[PDB]
């Protein structure tokens, strides 16, 4: 019951995600080295890397490049951390509640991310998010529709053409529902779709809390060389 | 402005 166009869309997004996500984690050797705000330079380098991948991903979702430049920028700045948190589930493992990226030297757990200045009000819900998304056990297509739907939120600050944005989300979400209804015939379709948008709501709270702590981290690391230009454009600059 | 972000979008 999945239309040919919904099947093509899912296919496009899976192609986009594979091109902009690198499960060999081979550029990690290039970031500044981890140290165990001692982990800020490495973790900052990582998010600045990752944001660029998110931008690569965006540009390949149909109808995003067709947006005006200011809309794209306001969409990226609203959801950039939320999409990094989603896509990071790929490297997350419940075997020790870490993000592990090719080797144990690039293995991040809740403690390493407090040596980058963050606090329990974000980290604890962060790892609970990671564990619970794992238990969702999403198919590759559900994963990538979620990252796209989280980007095409017409309610973000600064969005000028909200009608166009809602149309793309409409399309995105109709396709998600259809997939759930086909692929999971034994579950309540309403129940499955709700458990996924619920994650989108918890991504907004993770994002507000991250925003809050970043303000003070960046102010703290203002004279040091710790934050790279891209994070400053995305998250703020004091 | 947002120099780098602007250049990524091309
Ligand atoms: C990114 C990706 C990865 C990990 C993400 C993690 C684990 C380390 C801590 C991170 C980076 C969180 C930090 C609390 C964010 C802090 C950002 C800053 C220090 C600038 O305020 C955000 C998501 C978490 C690895 C790989 O999956 C690519 C993915 O894309
Ligand atoms: Mg990647
Ligand atoms: Mg089923």
Coordinates of N, CA and C and ligand atoms in Angstrom, one line a residue:
Chain A
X1 N 0.8 -1.2 0.0 CA 0.0 0.0 0.0 C 0.9 1.3 0.0
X2 N 2.1 1.1 -0.4 CA 3.1 2.2 -0.4 C 3.2 2.7 -1.9
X3 N 2.8 3.9 -2.1 CA 2.8 4.4 -3.5 C 4.2 4.5 -4.1
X4 N 4.2 4.5 -5.4 CA 5.5 4.5 -6.1 C 6.3 5.7 -5.7
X5 N 5.6 6.9 -5.5 CA 6.3 8.1 -5.1 C 6.8 8.1 -3.7
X6 N 6.1 7.6 -2.8 CA 6.6 7.4 -1.4 C 7.8 6.5 -1.4
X7 N 7.7 5.4 -2.2 CA 8.9 4.5 -2.2 C 10.1 5.2 -2.8
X8 N 9.9 6.1 -3.8 CA 11.0 6.8 -4.4 C 11.6 7.8 -3.4
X9 N 10.7 8.4 -2.6 CA 11.2 9.4 -1.6 C 12.0 8.8 -0.5
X10 N 11.5 7.7 0.1 CA 12.3 6.9 1.0 C 13.7 6.5 0.4
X11 N 13.7 6.1 -0.8 CA 14.9 5.7 -1.5 C 15.9 6.8 -1.6
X12 N 15.4 8.0 -2.0 CA 16.2 9.2 -2.1 C 16.8 9.5 -0.8
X13 N 16.1 9.4 0.3 CA 16.6 9.8 1.6 C 17.6 8.9 2.2
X14 N 17.4 7.6 1.9 CA 18.3 6.6 2.3 C 19.7 6.7 1.6
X15 N 19.6 7.0 0.3 CA 20.8 7.4 -0.5 C 21.5 8.6 0.1
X16 N 20.7 9.6 0.4 CA 21.3 10.8 1.0 C 22.0 10.5 2.3
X17 N 21.3 9.7 3.2 CA 21.9 9.5 4.5 C 23.2 8.7 4.4
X18 N 23.2 7.7 3.5 CA 24.4 6.9 3.4 C 25.6 7.7 2.9
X19 N 25.3 8.6 1.9 CA 26.3 9.4 1.4 C 26.9 10.4 2.5
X20 N 26.1 10.9 3.4 CA 26.5 11.9 4.3 C 26.8 11.3 5.7
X21 N 26.8 10.0 5.9 CA 27.1 9.4 7.2 C 28.2 8.3 7.0
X22 N 29.3 8.4 7.7 CA 30.5 7.6 7.5 C 30.7 6.6 8.6
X23 N 30.2 5.4 8.5 CA 30.3 4.4 9.6 C 31.8 3.9 9.7
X24 N 32.8 4.3 9.0 CA 34.1 3.9 9.3 C 34.8 5.0 10.2
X25 N 34.2 6.1 10.4 CA 34.7 7.1 11.3 C 36.2 7.5 11.1
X26 N 36.6 7.6 9.8 CA 38.0 7.7 9.5 C 38.5 9.1 9.6
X27 N 37.6 10.2 9.5 CA 38.1 11.5 9.7 C 38.3 11.9 11.2
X28 N 37.9 11.0 12.1 CA 38.1 11.3 13.5 C 39.6 11.6 13.9
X29 N 40.5 10.9 13.2 CA 41.9 11.2 13.5 C 42.3 12.7 13.3
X30 N 41.5 13.4 12.5 CA 41.8 14.8 12.2 C 41.4 15.8 13.2
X31 N 40.3 15.5 13.9 CA 39.9 16.5 15.0 C 41.1 16.7 15.9
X32 N 41.0 17.8 16.7 CA 41.9 18.0 17.8 C 41.8 16.8 18.7
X33 N 42.8 16.4 19.4 CA 42.8 15.1 20.2 C 41.9 15.2 21.4
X34 N 41.2 14.1 21.7 CA 40.5 14.0 23.0 C 41.5 14.1 24.2
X35 N 41.0 14.7 25.3 CA 41.8 14.7 26.5 C 40.8 14.4 27.7
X36 N 41.1 13.5 28.6 CA 40.2 13.1 29.7 C 40.9 13.4 31.0
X37 N 36.9 21.7 31.0 CA 36.5 21.6 29.6 C 37.6 21.0 28.8
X38 N 38.1 19.8 29.3 CA 39.2 19.2 28.6 C 38.8 18.5 27.3
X39 N 37.6 18.0 27.2 CA 37.1 17.3 26.0 C 36.4 18.3 25.0
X40 N 36.5 19.6 25.3 CA 35.7 20.5 24.4 C 36.3 20.6 23.0
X41 N 37.6 20.8 22.9 CA 38.1 20.9 21.5 C 37.8 19.7 20.6
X42 N 37.8 18.5 21.2 CA 37.6 17.3 20.3 C 36.1 17.2 20.0
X43 N 35.3 17.3 21.1 CA 33.8 17.2 20.9 C 33.3 18.3 20.0
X44 N 33.9 19.5 20.2 CA 33.5 20.7 19.4 C 33.8 20.4 17.9
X45 N 35.1 20.0 17.6 CA 35.5 19.6 16.3 C 34.5 18.6 15.7
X46 N 34.0 17.6 16.5 CA 33.2 16.6 16.0 C 31.8 17.1 15.6
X47 N 31.2 18.0 16.4 CA 29.9 18.5 16.1 C 30.0 19.4 14.8
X48 N 31.1 20.2 14.7 CA 31.3 21.0 13.5 C 31.5 20.2 12.3
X49 N 32.2 19.1 12.4 CA 32.2 18.1 11.3 C 30.8 17.6 11.0
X50 N 30.1 17.1 12.1 CA 28.8 16.5 11.9 C 27.8 17.5 11.3
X51 N 27.8 18.8 11.8 CA 26.8 19.7 11.2 C 27.0 19.8 9.7
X52 N 28.2 19.7 9.2 CA 28.4 19.8 7.7 C 27.8 18.6 7.0
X53 N 27.8 17.4 7.6 CA 27.1 16.2 7.1 C 25.6 16.5 7.1
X54 N 25.1 17.0 8.2 CA 23.7 17.4 8.3 C 23.3 18.3 7.1
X55 N 24.2 19.3 6.8 CA 23.9 20.2 5.7 C 24.0 19.4 4.4
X56 N 24.9 18.5 4.2 CA 24.9 17.7 3.0 C 23.6 16.9 2.9
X57 N 23.2 16.4 4.0 CA 21.9 15.6 4.0 C 20.7 16.5 3.6
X58 N 20.6 17.6 4.3 CA 19.5 18.6 4.0 C 19.4 18.8 2.5
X59 N 20.5 19.3 1.9 CA 20.5 19.7 0.5 C 20.0 18.6 -0.5
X60 N 20.0 17.4 0.0 CA 19.5 16.3 -0.8 C 18.0 15.9 -0.6
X61 N 17.4 16.5 0.4 CA 15.9 16.3 0.6 C 15.1 17.1 -0.5
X62 N 14.2 16.5 -1.2 CA 13.6 17.3 -2.3 C 12.7 18.4 -1.7
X63 N 12.9 19.6 -2.3 CA 12.2 20.8 -1.9 C 13.0 21.7 -0.9
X64 N 14.2 21.3 -0.4 CA 14.9 22.1 0.6 C 15.8 23.1 -0.2
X65 N 16.5 22.6 -1.2 CA 17.3 23.6 -2.0 C 16.5 24.6 -2.6
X66 N 15.2 24.3 -2.9 CA 14.2 25.2 -3.5 C 13.8 26.3 -2.5
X67 N 14.1 26.2 -1.2 CA 13.8 27.2 -0.3 C 14.8 28.4 -0.5
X68 N 14.3 29.6 0.0 CA 15.2 30.7 0.0 C 16.3 30.5 1.0
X69 N 17.4 31.2 0.9 CA 18.6 31.0 1.7 C 18.4 31.2 3.2
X70 N 17.6 32.2 3.5 CA 17.4 32.5 4.9 C 16.5 31.5 5.6
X71 N 15.6 30.9 4.9 CA 14.8 29.8 5.4 C 15.6 28.6 5.7
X72 N 16.4 28.2 4.7 CA 17.3 27.0 5.0 C 18.2 27.3 6.2
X73 N 18.8 28.5 6.3 CA 19.6 28.8 7.5 C 18.8 28.7 8.8
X74 N 17.6 29.3 8.8 CA 16.8 29.2 10.0 C 16.4 27.8 10.4
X75 N 16.1 27.0 9.4 CA 15.8 25.6 9.6 C 17.0 24.8 10.2
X76 N 18.2 25.0 9.6 CA 19.4 24.4 10.1 C 19.7 24.8 11.5
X77 N 19.6 26.1 11.8 CA 20.0 26.5 13.1 C 19.0 26.1 14.2
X78 N 17.7 25.8 13.8 CA 16.7 25.4 14.7 C 16.9 23.9 15.1
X79 N 17.3 23.1 14.2 CA 17.3 21.6 14.3 C 18.6 21.0 14.3
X80 N 19.7 21.7 14.2 CA 21.0 21.1 13.9 C 21.4 20.1 15.0
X81 N 21.3 20.5 16.3 CA 21.7 19.6 17.3 C 20.7 18.4 17.4
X82 N 19.4 18.7 17.2 CA 18.4 17.6 17.2 C 18.7 16.5 16.2
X83 N 19.3 16.9 15.1 CA 19.6 16.0 14.0 C 20.9 15.2 14.2
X84 N 21.8 15.9 14.9 CA 23.0 15.3 15.3 C 22.7 14.2 16.4
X85 N 21.8 14.5 17.3 CA 21.4 13.6 18.4 C 20.8 12.3 17.7
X86 N 19.8 12.5 16.8 CA 19.2 11.4 16.1 C 20.3 10.5 15.4
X87 N 21.1 11.1 14.5 CA 21.9 10.3 13.7 C 23.0 9.7 14.5
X88 N 23.3 10.2 15.7 CA 24.3 9.6 16.6 C 23.9 8.2 17.1
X89 N 22.6 7.9 17.1 CA 22.2 6.6 17.5 C 22.9 5.5 16.8
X90 N 23.3 5.7 15.5 CA 24.1 4.7 14.7 C 25.3 4.3 15.5
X91 N 26.0 5.2 16.1 CA 27.3 4.9 16.9 C 27.0 4.5 18.3
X92 N 25.8 4.7 18.8 CA 25.5 4.4 20.2 C 25.3 2.9 20.4
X93 N 25.7 2.5 21.6 CA 25.6 1.1 21.9 C 25.2 1.0 23.4
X94 N 24.1 0.2 23.7 CA 23.7 0.0 25.1 C 24.6 -1.0 25.8
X95 N 25.5 -1.6 25.2 CA 26.5 -2.5 25.8 C 27.2 -1.8 26.9
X96 N 27.5 -0.5 26.7 CA 28.1 0.3 27.8 C 27.7 1.8 27.7
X97 N 26.5 2.1 27.0 CA 26.0 3.4 27.0 C 27.1 4.4 26.5
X98 N 27.7 4.1 25.4 CA 28.7 5.0 24.8 C 28.3 5.2 23.3
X99 N 28.9 6.3 22.8 CA 29.0 6.4 21.4 C 30.4 6.0 21.0
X100 N 30.5 4.9 20.2 CA 31.8 4.4 19.8 C 32.0 4.5 18.3
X101 N 33.1 5.1 17.9 CA 33.3 5.5 16.5 C 34.6 4.9 16.0
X102 N 34.6 3.6 15.8 CA 35.7 3.0 15.1 C 36.7 2.3 16.0
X103 N 36.8 2.7 17.3 CA 37.9 2.3 18.1 C 37.6 2.9 19.5
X104 N 38.3 2.4 20.5 CA 38.1 2.8 21.9 C 38.6 4.2 22.1
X105 N 39.5 4.7 21.3 CA 39.9 6.1 21.6 C 38.8 7.1 21.2
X106 N 38.0 6.8 20.2 CA 36.8 7.6 19.9 C 35.6 6.9 20.4
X107 N 35.6 6.8 21.8 CA 34.4 6.2 22.5 C 34.0 7.2 23.5
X108 N 32.8 7.7 23.4 CA 32.3 8.8 24.3 C 31.2 8.3 25.2
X109 N 31.4 8.5 26.5 CA 30.4 8.2 27.5 C 30.0 9.5 28.3
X110 N 29.0 9.4 29.2 CA 28.4 10.6 29.8 C 29.5 11.4 30.5
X111 N 30.6 10.8 30.9 CA 31.6 11.5 31.7 C 32.5 12.4 30.7
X112 N 32.9 11.8 29.6 CA 33.6 12.6 28.6 C 32.9 13.8 28.2
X113 N 31.6 13.8 28.1 CA 30.8 15.0 27.7 C 30.5 15.9 28.9
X114 N 31.0 15.6 30.1 CA 31.0 16.7 31.1 C 32.3 17.4 31.2
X115 N 33.4 16.7 30.7 CA 34.7 17.4 30.5 C 34.6 18.3 29.3
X116 N 33.5 18.4 28.6 CA 33.3 19.5 27.6 C 32.3 20.5 28.1
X117 N 32.0 20.5 29.4 CA 31.3 21.6 30.0 C 29.8 21.4 30.2
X118 N 29.2 20.3 29.7 CA 27.8 20.1 29.9 C 27.5 19.5 31.3
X119 N 26.2 19.4 31.6 CA 25.8 19.1 32.9 C 24.7 18.0 32.9
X120 N 24.3 17.5 34.0 CA 23.4 16.4 34.1 C 22.0 16.7 33.6
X121 N 21.5 18.0 33.7 CA 20.2 18.4 33.2 C 20.0 18.1 31.7
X122 N 21.1 18.0 31.0 CA 21.1 17.5 29.6 C 21.6 16.1 29.4
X123 N 22.7 15.7 30.0 CA 23.3 14.5 29.7 C 22.4 13.3 30.0
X124 N 21.9 13.3 31.3 CA 21.0 12.2 31.7 C 19.9 12.0 30.7
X125 N 19.1 13.0 30.4 CA 18.0 12.8 29.4 C 18.6 12.4 28.0
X126 N 19.8 12.9 27.7 CA 20.5 12.6 26.5 C 20.7 11.1 26.3
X127 N 21.2 10.4 27.4 CA 21.5 9.0 27.3 C 20.2 8.2 27.3
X128 N 19.2 8.6 28.2 CA 17.9 8.0 28.2 C 17.3 8.1 26.8
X129 N 17.4 9.2 26.1 CA 17.0 9.3 24.7 C 17.7 8.2 23.9
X130 N 19.0 8.1 24.0 CA 19.7 7.2 23.1 C 19.3 5.8 23.3
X131 N 19.2 5.4 24.6 CA 18.8 4.0 24.9 C 17.4 3.7 24.4
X132 N 16.5 4.7 24.5 CA 15.1 4.4 24.2 C 14.9 4.4 22.7
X133 N 15.6 5.2 21.9 CA 15.6 5.1 20.5 C 16.0 3.8 20.0
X134 N 17.1 3.2 20.6 CA 17.5 1.9 20.3 C 16.4 0.9 20.5
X135 N 15.7 1.0 21.6 CA 14.6 0.0 21.8 C 13.5 0.2 20.8
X136 N 13.3 1.4 20.3 CA 12.3 1.6 19.2 C 12.7 0.6 18.0
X137 N 14.0 0.4 17.8 CA 14.4 -0.5 16.7 C 13.7 0.0 15.4
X138 N 14.1 1.1 14.9 CA 13.6 1.7 13.7 C 14.2 1.1 12.4
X139 N 13.5 0.9 11.4 CA 14.0 0.5 10.1 C 14.8 1.7 9.5
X140 N 15.7 1.5 8.5 CA 16.5 2.6 8.0 C 15.6 3.7 7.4
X141 N 14.4 3.3 6.8 CA 13.6 4.4 6.2 C 12.9 5.2 7.3
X142 N 12.5 4.6 8.4 CA 11.9 5.4 9.5 C 13.0 6.3 10.1
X143 N 14.2 5.8 10.3 CA 15.3 6.7 10.7 C 15.4 8.0 9.9
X144 N 15.4 7.8 8.6 CA 15.7 9.0 7.7 C 14.6 9.9 7.5
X145 N 13.3 9.4 7.4 CA 12.1 10.3 7.5 C 12.1 11.1 8.8
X146 N 12.5 10.5 9.9 CA 12.5 11.3 11.1 C 13.5 12.5 11.0
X147 N 14.7 12.2 10.6 CA 15.7 13.3 10.4 C 15.2 14.4 9.5
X148 N 14.5 14.0 8.4 CA 14.0 15.0 7.5 C 12.8 15.8 8.0
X149 N 11.9 15.1 8.7 CA 10.7 15.7 9.3 C 11.1 16.7 10.4
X150 N 12.1 16.3 11.2 CA 12.7 17.2 12.2 C 13.3 18.5 11.6
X151 N 13.9 18.4 10.4 CA 14.3 19.5 9.7 C 13.2 20.4 9.2
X152 N 12.2 19.8 8.6 CA 11.1 20.6 8.0 C 10.0 20.9 8.9
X153 N 10.3 21.5 10.1 CA 9.4 22.0 11.0 C 9.0 23.4 10.7
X154 N 7.8 23.7 10.2 CA 7.4 25.1 9.9 C 7.3 26.0 11.0
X155 N 7.4 25.6 12.3 CA 7.2 26.4 13.5 C 8.5 27.0 14.0
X156 N 9.6 26.8 13.3 CA 10.9 27.3 13.9 C 11.0 28.9 13.7
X157 N 11.7 29.5 14.6 CA 11.9 31.0 14.5 C 12.6 31.3 13.1
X158 N 12.2 32.4 12.6 CA 12.8 32.9 11.4 C 12.2 32.4 10.1
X159 N 11.4 31.3 10.1 CA 10.9 30.7 8.9 C 10.0 31.7 8.2
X160 N 10.2 32.1 7.0 CA 9.4 33.0 6.3 C 8.3 32.3 5.4
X161 N 8.7 31.3 4.6 CA 7.7 30.6 3.8 C 7.2 29.4 4.6
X162 N 6.3 29.6 5.5 CA 5.9 28.5 6.4 C 5.0 27.6 5.6
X163 N 4.2 28.1 4.6 CA 3.3 27.2 3.8 C 4.1 26.2 3.1
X164 N 5.2 26.6 2.4 CA 6.0 25.7 1.7 C 6.6 24.6 2.6
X165 N 7.1 25.1 3.8 CA 7.7 24.1 4.7 C 6.7 23.1 5.2
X166 N 5.4 23.5 5.5 CA 4.4 22.6 6.0 C 4.1 21.6 4.9
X167 N 4.0 22.0 3.7 CA 3.7 21.1 2.6 C 4.8 19.9 2.5
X168 N 6.0 20.3 2.6 CA 7.1 19.3 2.6 C 7.0 18.3 3.7
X169 N 6.6 18.9 4.9 CA 6.5 18.0 6.1 C 5.2 17.1 5.9
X170 N 4.1 17.7 5.5 CA 2.9 16.9 5.1 C 3.4 15.7 4.3
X171 N 4.1 15.9 3.2 CA 4.6 14.8 2.4 C 5.4 13.9 3.2
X172 N 6.4 14.4 3.9 CA 7.2 13.5 4.7 C 6.4 12.6 5.7
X173 N 5.4 13.2 6.3 CA 4.7 12.5 7.4 C 3.7 11.5 6.8
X174 N 3.0 11.9 5.7 CA 2.2 11.0 5.0 C 3.0 9.7 4.6
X175 N 4.2 9.9 4.2 CA 5.0 8.8 3.7 C 5.4 7.9 4.9
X176 N 5.7 8.5 6.1 CA 6.0 7.8 7.3 C 4.8 6.9 7.7
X177 N 3.6 7.5 7.8 CA 2.4 6.8 8.1 C 2.2 5.6 7.2
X178 N 2.3 5.8 5.9 CA 2.1 4.7 4.9 C 3.0 3.5 5.2
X179 N 4.3 3.9 5.5 CA 5.3 2.8 5.8 C 5.0 2.0 7.0
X180 N 4.6 2.7 8.1 CA 4.2 2.1 9.3 C 3.0 1.2 9.1
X181 N 2.0 1.7 8.3 CA 0.8 0.9 8.1 C 1.1 -0.4 7.3
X182 N 2.1 -0.3 6.4 CA 2.5 -1.5 5.6 C 3.4 -2.4 6.4
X183 N 4.5 -1.9 6.9 CA 5.5 -2.7 7.5 C 5.2 -3.3 8.8
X184 N 4.3 -2.7 9.6 CA 3.9 -3.1 10.9 C 2.4 -3.4 11.0
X185 N 1.9 -4.4 10.3 CA 0.5 -4.6 10.3 C 0.0 -5.2 11.6
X186 N 0.8 -5.7 12.5 CA 0.4 -6.3 13.8 C 0.2 -5.3 14.9
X187 N 0.8 -4.1 14.8 CA 0.7 -3.1 15.8 C -0.4 -2.1 15.5
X188 N -0.8 -1.4 16.5 CA -1.7 -0.2 16.2 C -0.8 0.8 15.4
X189 N -1.3 1.2 14.2 CA -0.6 2.2 13.4 C -0.5 3.5 14.2
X190 N -1.6 3.9 14.8 CA -1.6 5.1 15.6 C -0.6 5.0 16.8
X191 N -0.5 3.9 17.4 CA 0.4 3.7 18.5 C 1.9 3.9 18.0
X192 N 2.2 3.2 16.9 CA 3.6 3.4 16.4 C 4.0 4.8 16.0
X193 N 3.1 5.4 15.3 CA 3.4 6.8 14.8 C 3.6 7.7 16.0
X194 N 2.7 7.5 17.1 CA 2.8 8.4 18.2 C 4.2 8.2 19.0
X195 N 4.7 7.0 19.0 CA 5.9 6.8 19.8 C 7.1 7.5 19.1
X196 N 7.0 7.7 17.8 CA 8.1 8.4 17.1 C 8.0 9.9 17.1
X197 N 6.8 10.5 16.9 CA 6.7 11.9 17.1 C 7.0 12.4 18.5
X198 N 6.6 11.5 19.5 CA 7.0 11.8 20.9 C 8.6 12.0 21.0
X199 N 9.4 11.2 20.3 CA 10.8 11.4 20.3 C 11.2 12.8 19.7
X200 N 10.4 13.3 18.7 CA 10.6 14.6 18.2 C 10.4 15.7 19.3
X201 N 9.4 15.4 20.1 CA 9.1 16.4 21.2 C 10.2 16.4 22.2
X202 N 10.8 15.3 22.5 CA 11.9 15.2 23.5 C 13.2 15.8 22.9
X203 N 13.3 15.7 21.6 CA 14.4 16.4 20.9 C 14.4 17.9 21.1
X204 N 13.2 18.5 21.1 CA 13.1 20.0 21.4 C 13.5 20.3 22.8
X205 N 13.2 19.5 23.8 CA 13.6 19.8 25.1 C 15.1 19.6 25.3
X206 N 15.7 18.5 24.7 CA 17.1 18.4 24.7 C 17.8 19.6 24.0
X207 N 17.2 20.2 23.0 CA 17.7 21.3 22.3 C 17.7 22.6 23.1
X208 N 16.6 22.9 23.7 CA 16.5 24.0 24.6 C 17.5 23.9 25.7
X209 N 17.6 22.7 26.3 CA 18.6 22.6 27.4 C 20.0 22.7 26.9
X210 N 20.3 22.2 25.7 CA 21.6 22.4 25.2 C 21.9 23.8 24.9
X211 N 21.0 24.5 24.3 CA 21.1 25.9 24.0 C 21.5 26.7 25.3
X212 N 20.8 26.4 26.4 CA 21.1 27.0 27.7 C 22.5 26.8 28.1
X213 N 23.0 25.6 28.2 CA 24.3 25.3 28.6 C 25.4 25.9 27.7
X214 N 25.1 25.8 26.4 CA 26.0 26.3 25.4 C 26.3 27.8 25.6
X215 N 25.3 28.6 25.8 CA 25.5 30.0 26.2 C 26.6 30.2 27.2
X216 N 26.6 29.4 28.3 CA 27.6 29.6 29.3 C 28.9 29.0 28.9
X217 N 28.9 27.8 28.3 CA 30.1 27.2 27.8 C 30.9 28.2 26.8
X218 N 30.1 28.8 25.9 CA 30.8 29.7 24.9 C 31.3 30.9 25.6
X219 N 30.5 31.6 26.4 CA 31.0 32.7 27.3 C 32.2 32.2 28.0
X220 N 32.2 31.0 28.6 CA 33.4 30.6 29.4 C 34.6 30.5 28.5
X221 N 34.5 29.9 27.3 CA 35.6 29.6 26.3 C 35.7 30.7 25.3
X222 N 35.5 32.0 25.7 CA 35.4 33.1 24.8 C 36.8 33.5 24.3
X223 N 37.8 33.6 25.2 CA 39.2 34.0 24.9 C 40.0 32.8 24.4
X224 N 39.7 31.6 24.8 CA 40.4 30.4 24.4 C 39.9 30.0 22.9
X225 N 40.7 29.1 22.3 CA 40.5 28.8 20.9 C 39.5 27.6 20.7
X226 N 38.6 27.4 21.7 CA 37.9 26.1 21.8 C 36.7 26.0 20.8
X227 N 36.0 27.1 20.5 CA 34.9 26.7 19.6 C 35.2 27.2 18.2
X228 N 34.8 26.3 17.2 CA 35.2 26.6 15.8 C 34.1 27.5 15.2
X229 N 34.4 28.1 14.1 CA 33.5 29.2 13.6 C 32.1 28.7 13.3
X230 N 31.9 27.4 12.8 CA 30.6 26.9 12.4 C 29.7 26.8 13.6
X231 N 30.2 26.3 14.7 CA 29.4 26.2 15.9 C 28.9 27.6 16.4
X232 N 29.8 28.6 16.2 CA 29.4 30.0 16.6 C 28.3 30.5 15.7
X233 N 28.3 30.2 14.4 CA 27.3 30.6 13.6 C 26.0 29.9 13.9
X234 N 26.0 28.6 14.2 CA 24.9 27.8 14.5 C 24.3 28.1 15.9
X235 N 25.1 27.8 16.9 CA 24.6 27.9 18.3 C 24.5 29.2 18.9
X236 N 25.4 30.1 18.5 CA 25.5 31.5 19.1 C 26.9 31.9 19.3
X237 N 27.1 33.1 19.6 CA 28.4 33.8 19.8 C 28.3 34.9 20.8
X238 N 29.0 34.8 21.9 CA 28.8 35.9 23.0 C 29.7 37.1 22.8
Chain B
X1 N 27.8 38.4 8.8 CA 26.6 37.5 8.7 C 27.0 36.1 9.1
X2 N 26.5 35.1 8.4 CA 26.9 33.7 8.6 C 27.8 33.2 7.5
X3 N 29.0 33.8 7.4 CA 29.8 33.5 6.2 C 29.9 32.0 5.9
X4 N 30.4 31.1 6.8 CA 30.6 29.8 6.4 C 29.3 29.1 6.0
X5 N 28.3 29.1 6.9 CA 27.0 28.5 6.6 C 26.5 28.9 5.2
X6 N 26.7 30.2 4.9 CA 26.3 30.6 3.5 C 27.1 29.8 2.5
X7 N 28.3 29.6 2.7 CA 29.1 28.9 1.6 C 28.8 27.4 1.6
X8 N 28.5 26.8 2.7 CA 28.0 25.4 2.7 C 26.8 25.2 1.8
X9 N 25.8 26.1 1.9 CA 24.6 26.0 1.1 C 24.9 26.2 -0.4
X10 N 26.2 26.4 -0.8 CA 26.6 26.1 -2.1 C 27.8 25.1 -2.2
Ligands
LIG1 C1 27.7 13.6 16.4 C2 27.8 12.3 16.1 C3 28.4 11.4 17.1 C4 28.3 11.5 18.4 C5 27.4 12.4 19.1 C6 27.4 12.5 20.5 C7 28.3 11.7 21.4 C8 29.3 12.7 22.0 C9 28.5 13.9 22.7 C10 27.5 14.5 21.7 C11 28.3 15.2 20.5 C12 26.5 15.5 22.3 C13 27.0 16.8 22.9 C14 26.3 17.0 24.3 C15 26.9 18.0 22.1 C16 27.8 19.1 22.5 C17 28.1 20.2 21.5 C18 28.9 21.4 22.2 C19 30.1 20.9 23.0 C20 29.4 22.3 21.1 O1 28.0 22.1 23.0 C21 25.6 15.8 21.0 C22 25.4 14.3 20.5 C23 26.5 13.5 21.1 C24 29.3 10.3 16.5 C25 28.9 9.9 15.1 O2 27.7 9.0 15.2 C26 28.5 11.1 14.2 C27 27.3 11.8 14.8 O3 26.9 12.8 14.0
LIG2 MG1 29.3 11.1 9.7
LIG3 MG1 4.1 -5.8 12.9

